[PDB]
Amino acid sequence: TDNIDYFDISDESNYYLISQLRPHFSNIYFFDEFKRYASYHTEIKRYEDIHKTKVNSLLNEASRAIGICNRAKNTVKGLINILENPQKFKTQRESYDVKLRQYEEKKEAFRGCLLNKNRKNLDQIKKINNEIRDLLEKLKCSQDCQTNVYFDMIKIYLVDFKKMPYENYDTFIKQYKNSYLSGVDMIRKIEKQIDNPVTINAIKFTQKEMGYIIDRFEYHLQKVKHSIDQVTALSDGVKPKQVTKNRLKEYYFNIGNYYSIFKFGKDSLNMLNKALIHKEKIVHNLLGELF
Amino acid sequence: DIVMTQSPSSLSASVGDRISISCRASQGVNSALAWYQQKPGKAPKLLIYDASTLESGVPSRFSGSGSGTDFALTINSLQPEDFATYYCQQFNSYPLTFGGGTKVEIKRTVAAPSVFIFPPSDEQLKSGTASVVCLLNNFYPREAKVQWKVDNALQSGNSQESVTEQDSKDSTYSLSSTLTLSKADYEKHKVYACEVTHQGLSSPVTKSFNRGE
Amino acid sequence: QVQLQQWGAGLLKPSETLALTCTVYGGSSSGYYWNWIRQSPGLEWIGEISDSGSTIYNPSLESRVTMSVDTSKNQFSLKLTSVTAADTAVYYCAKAILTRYNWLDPWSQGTLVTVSSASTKGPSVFPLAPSSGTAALGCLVKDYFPEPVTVSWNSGALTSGVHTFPAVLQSSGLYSLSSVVTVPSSSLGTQTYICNVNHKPSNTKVDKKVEP
């Protein structure tokens, strides 16, 4: 395993998802996308500093918090190779079941670190949310607020969606899940018919790694498709020419949050793509080492 | 400075045909191309952006293809409402470069002209100049020969011909010829005739008037 | 939706300053990227400006272009310097959303800019009366400068069969066009017909009735 960036964790409410890649939060892509919305309204052209004084401060604190867990990440990577490389396994002096117990303890400690050291920043996300709700209030319109920008940003978003190869990922993950369990069932039969446990544990462990990353690939794929399908629906549906300000606020929140999910999943699906590509090359090689 | 070049420069097709204009870029421009349509005496109308995205309300027969270096716009079922000059514009770099344009002249069945002649209005003769105008209404093709006979004498060097662009409803042209004679030269003669010649007319028709009656 | 309305001075003496302005209706003239394109018989991209801070001009005329955005007046203006006959074209302004998404959705109706030192002249409108299948009447707009001139009929009430010809450049230098219309011959007796001629550079507005 060259990199273990594929690990993530969500809060106990399962509402805030933290990733090892910038900006770690979808909410920052929300706030980053608000820098586009605020440029079109001369009535609120004060967010250029707020994005720099607050959103950049929140992002800088988020990057530092992940770096604190880097020492804990290096400990997990060491246990990854001992368990996935039988040649490296034959050097230590404990059983495989004893090494799994050290892996689950170190993994959740690393995943728990990303959440524990970022709890102060997750509470800051809702702070800028209310500031955005308050900042948008300064629009001089009240009952006939313009919706041209709202649909114009959907025009921009649907262009970025065509660069996203969602169909290729679905066929990729379909073959992968078909190839994953097919190799798992083949190991289930060989398990009792040979006597090479050290190599079989490297299979089942790398299979467990694939199974977890597949779960992350399936979740990020569905969240991307949901954002793509919902934003597309707002362009094919009704197009009101002017709505109220309170109605316009949730509009920016609706597409500003959805596009944050798409860009967040685009960063994760790309990373989870190579992670599954790399991890499968381990199992295919490890089975070649069995014959 | 990307140089966009589109071909062909001129194109002629049937009413139910399907045409395809191509646009080639000097350098790679990814999928950043906007296709436009411009009717005579108007502004360019957006049709397709980002190579494949259709603009809202634009007829679906307009098709966009291509990525990187080469692209192509395809009208799939032509219609007299599509006689225009189509352009292609890129926006991967600055300055934004436009294509040369592609005029799409629609071909229709032959139609004979409707000839009308106008004597100079009595207002203009008071100003020392006389303008007699002949009109050819709704005809095809554009080629047409107009001869001006004043008192049995054909004339040259005094006519000005202007023909409209191909119509968007019936794809037919219209031509107006104007003789700018001085009032003295006009006041001497009596018979002014407009002799037209067209492919649809078996015999070259002639409409005329008699001065003062 | 957002509309664009362009206003400015068409006729220009050489070495003067081409100054135009576009006022935005239905939307604010702020973060959007506003472009300027000119067309000479093709489409040349002049420059792009944004309230965000990105302003780019064409290198061929960079040393002479000035752009600005007025958020208070909801307007943005283009400016040309050292104007010559090479700058005679129809000038359009268009809206781009972002600096990487520069397709131009709305265009202004354009301002035909003519660069010449010739004094402006007012057109003469003379009727082309119908005489006695379908009747044909028209108006003759002769001797004017510069382009253009708009001809309508019955303040826009009569539209079908109406034709407006290009203005052939006469040897005197003044332009001249004719506008006609084909109507039923039975309509001649009762229905009146008037053409509306508008040559804005000369401020002249003529409404001539066509009666046999």
XYZ file of C-alpha atoms in Angstrom:
716
model
C 0.000 0.000 0.000
C 1.703 3.162 -1.246
C -0.908 5.431 0.364
C -3.695 4.911 2.893
C -5.670 8.048 2.025
C -8.784 5.910 1.404
C -9.739 6.079 5.102
C -12.525 8.424 6.181
C -14.832 8.916 9.155
C -18.146 10.635 9.838
C -19.452 12.136 13.058
C -21.656 10.114 15.397
C -24.686 11.787 13.791
C -23.385 10.632 10.365
C -23.796 14.185 9.030
C -20.217 15.479 8.622
C -17.857 13.370 6.503
C -14.099 13.935 6.817
C -11.654 12.917 4.086
C -7.857 13.028 3.980
C -7.962 15.117 0.777
C -8.513 18.863 0.695
C -10.736 20.506 1.641
C -11.751 17.469 3.746
C -15.308 18.851 3.994
C -18.042 19.269 1.418
C -19.098 22.338 3.413
C -15.899 24.080 2.310
C -16.808 23.417 -1.325
C -20.172 24.925 -0.389
C -18.406 27.973 1.062
C -15.983 27.942 -1.878
C -18.953 27.949 -4.260
C -20.551 30.837 -2.351
C -17.572 32.938 -3.462
C -19.066 32.583 -6.949
C -22.609 33.503 -5.884
C -21.494 36.574 -3.923
C -19.634 37.969 -6.947
C -22.876 38.461 -8.894
C -24.579 40.525 -6.160
C -23.030 43.960 -5.652
C -25.277 44.163 -2.578
C -23.122 41.651 -0.659
C -19.662 42.093 -2.182
C -18.090 41.871 1.282
C -17.666 38.071 1.286
C -14.358 38.264 -0.611
C -12.711 38.979 2.745
C -15.023 36.717 4.772
C -14.023 33.827 2.510
C -10.391 34.731 3.227
C -10.733 35.581 6.926
C -13.103 32.753 7.935
C -13.444 30.058 5.256
C -9.688 29.974 4.646
C -9.099 30.007 8.410
C -11.471 27.053 8.788
C -9.726 25.225 5.937
C -6.263 25.963 7.345
C -7.373 24.573 10.712
C -8.765 21.503 8.933
C -5.490 20.746 7.138
C -3.492 21.114 10.360
C -5.831 18.752 12.221
C -5.279 15.988 9.658
C -1.518 16.494 9.892
C -1.647 15.825 13.634
C -2.967 12.333 12.846
C -0.140 11.662 10.367
C 2.008 10.008 13.042
C -0.924 7.688 13.756
C -1.316 7.070 10.014
C 2.292 5.887 9.695
C 1.642 3.234 12.352
C -1.280 1.754 10.407
C 0.692 1.632 7.146
C 3.307 -0.522 8.869
C 0.721 -3.094 9.938
C -0.811 -2.996 6.440
C 2.276 -4.465 4.777
C 3.025 -7.118 7.415
C -0.496 -8.497 6.976
C -0.651 -8.143 3.178
C 2.916 -9.341 2.470
C 3.446 -12.947 3.651
C 7.193 -12.572 3.081
C 7.225 -9.689 5.567
C 4.835 -11.635 7.817
C 7.285 -14.531 8.258
C 9.691 -12.149 10.053
C 7.572 -11.135 13.062
C 6.775 -13.352 16.051
C 2.988 -13.226 16.545
C 0.007 -14.979 15.001
C -2.179 -13.520 12.264
C -5.131 -13.192 14.650
C -2.850 -11.244 16.993
C -1.877 -8.928 14.128
C -5.519 -8.312 13.191
C -6.205 -7.182 16.766
C -3.399 -4.630 16.424
C -4.734 -3.554 13.014
C -8.320 -2.845 14.088
C -7.018 -1.011 17.161
C -4.641 1.152 15.109
C -7.130 1.712 12.271
C -9.974 3.010 14.443
C -7.468 5.063 16.446
C -6.396 6.730 13.195
C -9.986 7.136 11.992
C -10.978 8.347 15.453
C -8.110 10.842 15.378
C -9.451 12.527 12.236
C -12.798 13.063 13.970
C -11.550 13.847 17.485
C -9.060 16.531 16.428
C -11.630 18.081 14.048
C -14.631 18.403 16.390
C -13.836 22.090 16.935
C -13.899 22.708 13.173
C -17.116 20.755 12.557
C -18.896 23.138 14.935
C -17.453 26.049 12.933
C -19.200 24.861 9.751
C -22.654 25.778 11.069
C -21.304 29.169 12.184
C -20.476 30.247 8.628
C -23.810 28.724 7.574
C -25.714 31.292 9.639
C -23.312 34.005 8.472
C -24.151 33.070 4.876
C -27.869 33.140 5.699
C -27.319 36.563 7.278
C -25.023 37.867 4.530
C -27.522 36.939 1.806
C -30.158 38.997 3.654
C -28.486 42.229 2.497
C -30.014 41.786 -0.975
C -32.137 44.876 -1.627
C -34.810 42.676 -3.212
C -37.422 41.148 -0.921
C -40.396 39.824 -2.905
C -39.151 39.779 -6.518
C -35.555 38.593 -6.164
C -33.867 37.625 -9.416
C -33.442 33.948 -10.305
C -31.213 34.425 -13.365
C -28.046 33.662 -11.387
C -29.659 30.602 -9.788
C -30.294 28.973 -13.169
C -27.072 30.351 -14.669
C -25.094 28.464 -12.023
C -27.018 25.313 -12.950
C -25.847 25.878 -16.529
C -22.270 25.898 -15.218
C -22.784 22.816 -13.041
C -24.307 20.662 -15.790
C -21.242 21.422 -17.925
C -18.914 20.090 -15.219
C -21.065 16.959 -14.889
C -20.344 15.916 -18.484
C -16.626 15.812 -17.658
C -17.482 13.287 -14.933
C -17.449 9.702 -16.328
C -20.210 8.290 -14.144
C -21.137 5.536 -16.608
C -17.549 4.262 -16.716
C -17.413 4.111 -12.907
C -20.649 2.107 -12.708
C -19.341 -0.529 -15.119
C -15.992 -0.403 -13.302
C -17.536 -0.988 -9.873
C -19.944 -3.607 -11.257
C -17.098 -5.709 -12.658
C -15.121 -5.070 -9.467
C -17.855 -6.329 -7.137
C -18.362 -9.237 -9.542
C -14.630 -10.004 -9.493
C -14.348 -9.397 -5.738
C -16.835 -11.935 -4.370
C -15.948 -14.418 -7.122
C -12.386 -14.526 -5.804
C -13.652 -14.646 -2.220
C -15.730 -17.755 -2.949
C -12.752 -19.458 -4.611
C -10.730 -18.919 -1.426
C -13.584 -20.412 0.619
C -13.165 -23.743 -1.191
C -9.349 -23.840 -1.188
C -9.296 -22.882 2.510
C -9.656 -26.442 3.831
C -7.956 -28.237 0.914
C -4.393 -26.873 1.291
C -1.997 -25.987 4.127
C -0.565 -22.497 3.534
C -2.227 -20.268 6.143
C 0.148 -17.290 5.943
C -0.665 -16.709 2.272
C -4.405 -17.246 2.797
C -4.475 -14.598 5.536
C -2.898 -12.120 3.115
C -5.746 -12.884 0.702
C -8.540 -12.502 3.263
C -6.949 -9.346 4.687
C -6.493 -7.705 1.284
C -10.036 -8.874 0.522
C -11.208 -7.077 3.668
C -9.378 -3.943 2.511
C -11.074 -4.188 -0.887
C -14.464 -4.770 0.736
C -14.137 -1.593 2.794
C -12.931 0.523 -0.137
C -15.726 -0.905 -2.307
C -18.187 0.336 0.322
C -16.624 3.798 0.097
C -16.730 3.635 -3.706
C -20.412 2.654 -3.711
C -21.356 5.422 -1.267
C -19.472 8.171 -3.109
C -20.825 6.923 -6.446
C -24.448 7.134 -5.283
C -23.928 10.566 -3.708
C -22.463 11.821 -6.997
C -25.343 10.380 -9.028
C -27.855 11.882 -6.589
C -26.289 15.339 -6.914
C -26.089 14.978 -10.702
C -29.691 13.794 -11.053
C -31.130 16.411 -8.692
C -29.297 19.415 -10.168
C -30.322 18.221 -13.637
C -33.949 18.054 -12.491
C -33.927 21.723 -11.456
C -32.917 22.666 -15.017
C -35.548 20.481 -16.709
C -38.328 21.557 -14.325
C -40.025 24.895 -13.795
C -38.058 28.132 -14.240
C -39.621 30.926 -12.165
C -38.449 34.357 -13.271
C -38.453 35.975 -9.811
C -39.076 34.557 -6.333
C -38.811 35.828 -2.761
C -35.523 36.251 -0.908
C -36.227 33.468 1.598
C -37.070 31.213 -1.348
C -33.834 32.303 -3.044
C -31.657 31.513 -0.010
C -32.494 27.800 0.050
C -31.929 27.791 -3.722
C -28.271 28.745 -3.266
C -28.057 26.250 -0.404
C -29.703 23.546 -2.523
C -27.376 23.724 -5.529
C -24.410 25.080 -3.563
C -24.513 22.022 -1.311
C -25.211 19.585 -4.160
C -22.282 20.821 -6.252
C -20.159 20.529 -3.112
C -21.126 16.846 -2.905
C -20.294 16.278 -6.581
C -16.868 17.915 -6.325
C -16.325 16.091 -3.023
C -17.195 12.728 -4.559
C -15.149 13.511 -7.667
C -12.065 13.852 -5.462
C -12.935 10.704 -3.499
C -14.031 8.512 -6.422
C -10.774 9.290 -8.237
C -8.747 8.374 -5.149
C -10.874 5.311 -4.362
C -10.450 4.295 -8.016
C -6.667 3.898 -7.840
C -6.919 2.410 -4.340
C -9.111 -0.415 -5.646
C -6.862 -0.723 -8.709
C -3.816 -1.042 -6.448
C -5.418 -3.367 -3.891
C -6.718 -5.761 -6.553
C -3.226 -6.039 -8.047
C -2.169 -7.366 -4.633
C -4.759 -10.158 -4.534
C -4.177 -11.136 -8.171
C -0.430 -11.252 -7.509
C -0.920 -13.057 -4.188
C -2.947 -15.765 -5.947
C -0.192 -16.122 -8.536
C 2.132 -16.696 -5.582
C -0.129 -19.660 -4.722
C 0.788 -21.510 -7.937
C -3.730 33.017 -30.698
C -5.813 29.991 -31.671
C -6.978 30.078 -35.299
C -10.431 28.562 -35.790
C -11.308 27.523 -39.346
C -14.657 26.037 -40.363
C -15.619 24.416 -43.662
C -17.331 24.660 -45.999
C -17.675 28.427 -46.368
C -20.839 27.999 -48.462
C -23.344 25.151 -48.411
C -26.514 24.331 -50.349
C -28.938 21.542 -49.456
C -32.537 20.421 -49.913
C -35.516 21.099 -47.642
C -35.539 17.751 -45.835
C -31.788 17.202 -46.088
C -29.174 16.959 -43.327
C -26.016 19.068 -43.346
C -22.882 18.973 -41.210
C -20.469 21.880 -40.758
C -17.029 21.109 -39.331
C -14.825 23.351 -37.186
C -11.099 22.680 -36.759
C -8.947 24.321 -34.087
C -5.314 25.378 -34.402
C -4.611 23.882 -30.962
C -6.381 21.571 -28.543
C -9.402 23.359 -27.098
C -10.830 20.432 -25.082
C -14.666 20.542 -25.337
C -14.988 24.343 -25.114
C -16.872 25.296 -28.275
C -19.977 27.430 -28.783
C -22.009 27.117 -31.994
C -23.991 30.161 -33.129
C -26.584 31.063 -35.752
C -26.935 34.512 -37.320
C -29.875 35.594 -39.468
C -29.497 38.587 -41.814
C -29.586 41.952 -40.076
C -29.644 40.372 -36.611
C -27.333 39.241 -33.802
C -25.817 35.756 -33.445
C -28.077 33.339 -31.576
C -26.550 30.698 -29.318
C -27.296 27.132 -30.399
C -24.785 24.782 -28.741
C -22.124 25.336 -26.087
C -19.489 22.983 -24.678
C -19.548 21.037 -27.967
C -22.617 18.980 -26.987
C -24.901 21.061 -24.736
C -28.087 22.338 -26.382
C -29.405 25.757 -25.428
C -32.918 25.900 -24.003
C -35.734 26.064 -26.542
C -33.323 25.528 -29.452
C -34.678 22.903 -31.894
C -33.272 19.452 -31.160
C -32.291 18.825 -34.796
C -29.190 20.956 -34.138
C -26.467 18.464 -33.202
C -23.036 19.105 -31.714
C -20.087 16.738 -31.854
C -16.329 16.799 -31.406
C -13.664 17.151 -28.718
C -10.122 18.508 -28.660
C -9.009 19.483 -32.168
C -11.922 18.755 -34.527
C -15.657 19.339 -34.096
C -18.833 19.344 -36.175
C -22.306 20.915 -36.085
C -25.063 18.887 -37.764
C -28.482 20.102 -38.826
C -30.468 16.878 -39.063
C -33.685 17.907 -40.874
C -33.322 21.240 -42.682
C -36.086 23.837 -42.724
C -36.509 27.231 -44.453
C -36.138 28.754 -40.982
C -32.474 27.630 -40.970
C -31.090 29.765 -43.816
C -28.357 31.622 -41.926
C -24.598 31.867 -41.347
C -23.341 29.560 -38.597
C -20.157 30.192 -36.614
C -18.005 28.319 -34.116
C -16.197 29.924 -31.179
C -13.687 28.480 -28.717
C -12.999 29.538 -25.141
C -10.083 27.511 -23.795
C -7.702 30.460 -24.221
C -7.755 34.198 -24.856
C -8.428 35.896 -27.201
C -11.677 34.141 -28.124
C -11.454 33.183 -31.803
C -14.483 32.812 -34.076
C -14.909 30.652 -37.138
C -15.135 32.011 -40.650
C -18.839 31.272 -40.947
C -20.809 28.891 -43.155
C -23.652 30.230 -45.288
C -26.416 27.643 -45.728
C -28.457 28.414 -48.850
C -31.568 26.234 -48.997
C -32.668 24.837 -52.361
C -36.384 24.824 -53.213
C -38.567 24.209 -56.242
C -38.568 26.842 -58.973
C -40.967 29.780 -58.632
C -41.622 32.525 -61.178
C -41.374 36.211 -60.211
C -44.343 38.519 -59.740
C -43.439 41.693 -61.630
C -44.637 45.141 -60.553
C -43.587 48.564 -61.846
C -43.792 51.833 -59.909
C -43.803 55.239 -61.636
C -41.872 58.047 -59.927
C -44.053 59.639 -57.270
C -45.142 63.174 -58.143
C -43.367 64.303 -54.958
C -39.899 63.404 -56.243
C -40.290 64.974 -59.703
C -40.545 68.356 -57.967
C -36.955 67.800 -56.760
C -35.420 67.461 -60.232
C -34.917 63.684 -60.089
C -37.096 60.757 -61.154
C -36.966 57.216 -59.752
C -38.987 54.481 -61.468
C -38.831 51.170 -59.590
C -39.540 47.618 -60.762
C -40.207 44.804 -58.294
C -39.815 41.038 -58.666
C -41.699 39.382 -55.800
C -40.982 35.840 -54.566
C -38.854 34.049 -57.171
C -36.191 31.358 -57.337
C -33.346 31.086 -57.997
C -31.557 34.380 -57.298
C -30.323 34.661 -60.897
C -32.575 36.982 -62.894
C -32.080 39.401 -65.793
C -33.820 42.790 -65.641
C -33.849 45.007 -68.738
C -35.083 48.608 -68.691
C -36.704 49.902 -71.886
C -37.636 53.593 -72.076
C -39.688 54.469 -75.170
C -38.657 51.204 -76.894
C -34.978 51.808 -75.998
C -33.062 49.554 -73.622
C -30.860 51.401 -71.140
C -27.619 50.813 -69.254
C -25.612 52.729 -66.676
C -28.621 54.090 -64.777
C -30.127 51.060 -62.987
C -29.374 49.931 -59.433
C -30.345 46.389 -58.438
C -30.657 45.094 -54.875
C -31.828 41.588 -53.960
C -32.900 40.474 -50.494
C -31.400 37.521 -48.671
C -33.065 34.139 -49.057
C -36.411 34.272 -47.277
C -36.907 32.272 -44.083
C -40.517 31.257 -44.858
C -40.430 30.202 -48.529
C -36.714 30.480 -49.462
C -37.478 32.910 -52.300
C -35.650 36.097 -53.245
C -36.916 39.529 -54.287
C -35.224 42.108 -56.515
C -35.836 45.839 -56.949
C -34.412 47.837 -59.862
C -34.426 51.643 -59.781
C -33.791 53.986 -62.710
C -32.464 57.333 -61.458
C -33.189 59.618 -64.410
C -33.059 63.388 -64.209
C -36.517 64.942 -64.374
C -35.657 66.524 -67.732
C -34.621 63.154 -69.173
C -37.764 61.614 -67.675
C -40.126 64.412 -68.735
C -39.252 63.895 -72.418
C -40.345 60.264 -72.825
C -43.677 58.548 -72.211
C -43.290 54.742 -72.148
C -41.263 53.004 -69.422
C -41.085 49.207 -69.331
C -39.555 46.578 -67.042
C -38.434 43.515 -69.021
C -37.507 40.595 -66.762
C -36.136 37.173 -67.678
C -36.171 34.129 -65.407
C -35.899 30.351 -65.569
C -39.503 29.905 -64.426
C -40.993 32.214 -67.059
C -41.531 30.519 -70.420
C -41.819 33.928 -72.098
C -39.950 36.916 -70.602
C -42.766 38.975 -69.093
C -42.895 42.773 -69.253
C -44.818 45.254 -67.102
C -44.952 48.907 -68.112
C -46.774 52.206 -67.698
C -47.472 55.281 -69.815
C -46.342 58.651 -68.474
C -49.199 61.002 -67.615
C -52.077 58.525 -67.955
C -34.674 36.558 -18.184
C -31.755 38.963 -18.639
C -31.856 41.278 -21.659
C -29.208 43.516 -23.220
C -29.792 46.985 -24.687
C -26.965 48.807 -26.471
C -26.863 52.557 -27.096
C -24.141 54.770 -28.504
C -22.969 56.995 -31.335
C -22.830 55.251 -34.704
C -21.274 57.830 -37.010
C -17.715 58.775 -36.076
C -15.034 61.007 -37.515
C -11.584 59.384 -37.734
C -9.187 59.716 -34.789
C -12.204 60.195 -32.507
C -13.206 57.877 -29.642
C -15.767 55.123 -30.240
C -17.751 55.121 -26.982
C -20.570 52.620 -26.443
C -22.537 51.370 -23.450
C -24.834 48.433 -22.695
C -27.547 48.606 -20.030
C -28.671 45.312 -18.487
C -32.370 44.590 -17.947
C -33.567 41.677 -15.834
C -30.216 41.215 -14.104
C -27.383 43.006 -12.382
C -24.297 44.149 -14.287
C -21.812 42.746 -11.799
C -19.981 39.421 -11.588
C -20.955 38.369 -15.110
C -18.227 38.522 -17.755
C -19.312 40.999 -20.434
C -17.819 40.631 -23.915
C -17.662 42.887 -26.967
C -17.638 41.525 -30.524
C -17.541 43.413 -33.821
C -18.574 42.096 -37.235
C -17.295 43.319 -40.598
C -18.405 41.707 -43.913
C -16.046 38.103 -39.790
C -16.716 38.061 -36.052
C -13.806 39.633 -34.157
C -13.629 39.391 -30.365
C -12.699 42.768 -28.875
C -12.461 42.165 -25.144
C -13.987 40.808 -21.958
C -14.432 42.464 -18.561
C -15.751 41.391 -15.168
C -16.469 43.059 -11.846
C -14.387 40.261 -10.311
C -11.211 41.741 -11.789
C -10.539 39.797 -14.993
C -10.329 42.111 -18.019
C -8.731 40.833 -21.240
C -8.548 42.583 -24.618
C -7.642 41.380 -28.092
C -3.905 41.859 -28.797
C -4.720 43.326 -32.228
C -6.443 46.314 -30.579
C -5.256 46.086 -26.949
C -3.427 49.432 -27.114
C -6.715 51.224 -27.911
C -9.486 49.505 -25.886
C -10.912 50.645 -22.548
C -13.693 48.845 -20.672
C -15.560 49.593 -17.451
C -18.474 48.294 -15.377
C -20.949 50.528 -13.520
C -22.818 48.479 -10.921
C -24.845 51.486 -9.742
C -26.170 52.415 -13.194
C -26.348 48.710 -14.193
C -24.161 49.431 -17.221
C -20.820 48.578 -18.793
C -19.062 50.588 -21.488
C -16.513 49.893 -24.212
C -14.145 52.496 -25.632
C -11.984 52.650 -28.756
C -9.260 55.174 -29.561
C -7.632 56.474 -32.750
C -10.567 55.176 -34.770
C -10.023 54.688 -38.502
C -11.957 53.147 -41.398
C -10.663 49.727 -40.293
C -12.943 49.953 -37.226
C -16.165 50.305 -39.255
C -18.311 47.384 -38.094
C -21.444 46.420 -36.194
C -20.589 46.289 -32.490
C -22.272 43.785 -30.172
C -22.082 43.247 -26.422
C -22.694 39.803 -24.950
C -22.797 38.110 -21.552
C -20.455 35.339 -20.434
C -21.051 33.597 -17.114
C -17.499 32.622 -16.120
C -13.971 33.034 -17.468
C -13.856 29.329 -18.416
C -17.469 29.185 -19.692
C -17.379 31.987 -22.254
C -20.324 31.045 -24.469
C -22.361 34.208 -25.010
C -26.065 33.610 -24.404
C -27.596 37.113 -24.836
C -26.513 39.570 -27.534
C -27.473 43.197 -27.943
C -29.108 44.312 -31.177
C -25.798 45.962 -32.094
C -24.840 49.511 -33.029
C -23.751 49.975 -36.643
C -20.578 52.065 -36.307
C -19.424 53.941 -39.414
C -16.101 55.800 -39.397
C -16.154 58.702 -41.853
C -15.865 62.487 -41.948
C -18.857 62.887 -44.276
C -21.699 64.922 -42.806
C -24.887 63.043 -41.987
C -27.813 63.418 -44.386
C -31.540 62.913 -43.962
C -33.408 60.486 -46.206
C -36.289 61.314 -48.521
C -39.347 59.044 -48.379
C -41.372 58.792 -51.585
C -44.328 56.420 -52.045
C -44.535 53.603 -54.580
C -48.267 53.665 -55.211
C -50.317 50.629 -56.289
C -52.165 50.606 -59.595
C -55.115 48.780 -61.133
C -54.114 39.177 -58.492
C -52.463 40.802 -55.480
C -51.534 44.468 -55.206
C -48.002 45.661 -54.458
C -47.172 49.000 -52.823
C -44.035 50.316 -51.193
C -41.894 53.185 -49.957
C -38.668 54.541 -51.463
C -36.033 55.744 -48.983
C -33.406 57.610 -51.004
C -30.288 59.693 -50.357
C -29.148 59.274 -46.750
C -25.925 58.755 -44.822
C -24.851 56.859 -42.916
C -26.338 53.413 -42.433
C -28.719 52.185 -41.149
C -32.436 52.968 -41.443
C -35.390 50.922 -40.186
C -38.579 50.644 -42.254
C -41.830 49.231 -40.884
C -45.503 49.359 -41.896
C -48.523 50.536 -39.884
C -46.328 50.829 -36.765
C -45.774 47.070 -36.987
C -49.394 46.097 -37.672
C -48.653 44.938 -41.240
C -45.954 42.254 -41.323
C -46.679 39.518 -43.876
C -45.425 40.047 -47.417
C -43.251 42.980 -46.316
C -39.810 43.194 -47.926
C -36.951 45.564 -47.079
C -34.072 45.611 -49.555
C -30.415 46.371 -48.809
C -29.315 49.927 -49.554
C -27.281 50.078 -52.759
C -24.448 52.579 -52.353
C -25.185 55.218 -54.983
C -22.438 56.986 -56.914
C -23.193 60.134 -54.888
C -22.144 58.257 -51.740
C -25.627 58.361 -50.201
C -27.508 55.147 -49.492
C -30.973 54.301 -50.791
C -33.336 51.379 -50.203
C -36.921 50.450 -51.024
C -39.465 48.648 -48.846
C -42.551 47.046 -50.394
C -45.423 44.755 -49.400
C -47.848 42.500 -51.278
C -51.475 42.911 -50.182
C -54.819 41.839 -51.675
C -56.126 44.207 -54.334
C -59.514 44.338 -52.590
C -57.799 45.830 -49.517
C -56.797 48.921 -51.523
C -60.227 50.545 -51.421
C -60.790 50.624 -47.658
C -57.553 49.752 -45.822
C -55.002 52.537 -45.430
C -51.271 51.856 -45.690
C -48.441 53.885 -44.147
C -44.719 53.139 -43.936
C -42.543 54.178 -40.986
C -38.979 55.263 -41.808
C -36.397 55.861 -39.063
C -32.907 57.202 -39.809
C -31.541 57.707 -36.300
C -28.182 59.411 -37.144
C -30.062 62.322 -38.748
C -32.801 62.141 -36.058
C -35.271 62.114 -38.961
C -38.509 60.155 -38.525
C -40.890 60.160 -41.501
C -44.299 58.468 -41.745
C -45.569 58.572 -45.337
C -48.975 57.265 -46.396
C -49.115 55.352 -49.682
C -52.218 56.365 -51.633
C -52.632 55.812 -55.428
